[PDB]
């Protein structure tokens, strides 16, 4: 696995020792090369995981996420080139290094074989994120947003540390393979209930469960574009990956302990989609849409059926791509009008035609249009939940309807109508932004030809 870790580390001295006219170019070149190399990790075996060594391993769950991170880093660089153009060279290098450290930490989380190493790195991801959100954010709310995010994550994760150490002491090991083979049923005692909670709430905070989701809108709104990109694409899927990894040792107590979280997510999807129906900030609308989409992944993980896990993996990948692209489009609009108000700039379908097509395709993917992987994941989760209980279909259908409603409402409000008269600074879209949207969309559409790659280890 070091074939990906070592170049990621070498990115730092490269950027630090590169000329001020070549940081972005070199970073993009070698991040894209790293993604190309990490594409080799998709050759997963049917039954056994790829055990590179004692410390790192990868299965059909880790590989798609690793590829997504290695692919998203260049996209973040391209999106963050614009506003970080008048910054000094040292701060640009610092921002690039923060992004690289975040990517490295994400890789080592998705490849870790030890639960405690996974925890260490998955909590280490906070520091680069928090710095990015509180240092290069534009608003004055970036300070409160960073605190909310950091403290929600830590208050969720510290009991997870306690529980992991307790499990290490009792079972003797935290290795995923051993903890999977030497698995044992959990009794219905209060101690097991609280161990289950300690293991679950940490990831429930990460992928925002309805009620613990208040940090996501602040974090996604106040952070810069690249920060929002990671937070939406990978930092939310961290919780899902952790939950899918740890649910092995949390049975059969889950059957009875999942009801509160299942109900919370199945109602919060509707609540957050309705909130999206009545949002005035584009980034806030996208963040609440992300909450609504991750509610389905939470449900799928808490049901623990093979179709649910496949749908969860597919939805994670698809939602990461779609949310990142939506945030990039909103960033372009913001950099054009210097405001995040949705109703401020209207009739953009007549001034930026290709950007309108990008918005249309992104919204279609967001509302789970067949045969996109978004729909593949959503339909798999819906079938799994229907098998779990037939009543679930009502909430699932209502959520789908409201998602289509608010996505098309965003499309109509932004890229339709009469152009805003007074706004005169809307210049023709650059090649960089269009290339960013194309690099967001094309892998997403291509994955529908080979959906088996992102369907998880249970395919």
């Amino acid at each position: 696995m070091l074939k990906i870790i070592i170049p990621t580390t070498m990115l730092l001295p490269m950027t630090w020792m590169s000329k001020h006219n070549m940081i972005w170019i070199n970073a993009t070149v070698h991040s894209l090369l790293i993604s190309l190399i990490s594409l080799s990790l998709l050759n997963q075996l049917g039954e056994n995981s790829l055990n590179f060594s004692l410390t790192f391993f990868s299965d059909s769950l880790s590989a798609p996420l690793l590829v997504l991170t290695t692919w998203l880093l260049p996209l973040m660089l391209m999106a963050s080139q614009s506003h970080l153009s008048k910054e000094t060279t040292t701060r640009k290098k610092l921002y690039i290094t923060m992004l690289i450290l975040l990517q490295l930490f994400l890789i080592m989380t998705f490849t870790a074989t030890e639960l405690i190493l996974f925890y260490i790195l998955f909590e280490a991801t906070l520091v680069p994120t928090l710095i990015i959100i509180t240092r290069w954010g534009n608003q004055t709310e970036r300070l409160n947003a960073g605190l909310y995010f950091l403290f929600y994550t830590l208050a969720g994760s510290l009991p997870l540390l306690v529980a992991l150490v307790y499990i290490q002491n009792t079972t003797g090991s935290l290795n995923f393979l051993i903890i999977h083979y030497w698995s044992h049923p959990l009794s219905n005692s209060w101690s097991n209930i609280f161990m289950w909670l300690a293991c679950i709430m940490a990831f429930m905070v990460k992928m925002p469960l309805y009620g613990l989701h208040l940090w996501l809108p602040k974090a996604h709104v106040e952070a810069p574009i690249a920060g929002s990109m990671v937070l939406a694409a990978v930092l939310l899927k961290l919780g899902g990956y952790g939950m899918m990894r740890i649910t092995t040792i949390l049975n059969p107590l889950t059957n009875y302990m999942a009801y509160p979280f299942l109900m919370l997510s199945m109602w919060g999807m509707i609540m957050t989609s309705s909130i999206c129906l009545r949002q005035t900030d584009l980034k806030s609308l996208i963040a609440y849409s992300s909450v609504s989409h991750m509610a389905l992944v939470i449900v799928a993980i808490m049901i623990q059926t093979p179709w649910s896990f496949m749908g969860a993996t597919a939805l994670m990948i698809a939602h990461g791509l779609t949310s990142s692209m939506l945030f990039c489009l909103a960033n372009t609009n913001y950099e054009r009008v210097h405001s995040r108000t949705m109703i401020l700039a209207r009739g953009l379908q007549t001034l930026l035609p290709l950007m309108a097509t990008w918005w249309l395709m992104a919204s279609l993917t967001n509302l789970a249009l067949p045969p996109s992987i978004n729909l593949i994941g959503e339909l798999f989760i819906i079938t799994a939940s229907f098998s779990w209980s037939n009543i679930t279909i009502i909430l699932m259908g209502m959520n789908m309807m409201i998602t289509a409603l608010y996505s098309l409402y965003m499309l109509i409000t932004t890229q339709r109508g009469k152009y805003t008269h007074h706004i005169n600074n809307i210049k023709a879209s650059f090649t960089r932004e269009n290339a960013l949207m194309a690099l967001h969309i094309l892998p997403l559409l291509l994955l529908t030809l080979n959906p088996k790659m992102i369907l998880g280890p249970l395919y």
């Binding site: 004692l54 410390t55 870790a112 074989t113 030890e114 405690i116 190493l117 290490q168 935290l174």
Partner: protein, 49 residues
């Protein structure tokens, strides 16, 4: 001359246990042979060495 330490030739046996001491407790087992490296190094969580 009255302060010098003298030898006294007696016939009464020398007391075996003047303090009436109990049996001294058995000492702990004392060490072992040569040292060998730890089986898999420091078995501290994820550290392989």
């Amino acid at each position: 001359e009255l302060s010098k330490v003298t030898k006294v030739k007696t016939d009464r046996p020398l007391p075996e246990n003047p303090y009436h001491s109990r049996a001294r407790p058995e000492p702990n087992p004392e060490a072992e042979g040569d040292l060998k490296p730890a089986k898999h190094g420091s078995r501290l969580f994820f550290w392989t060495m």
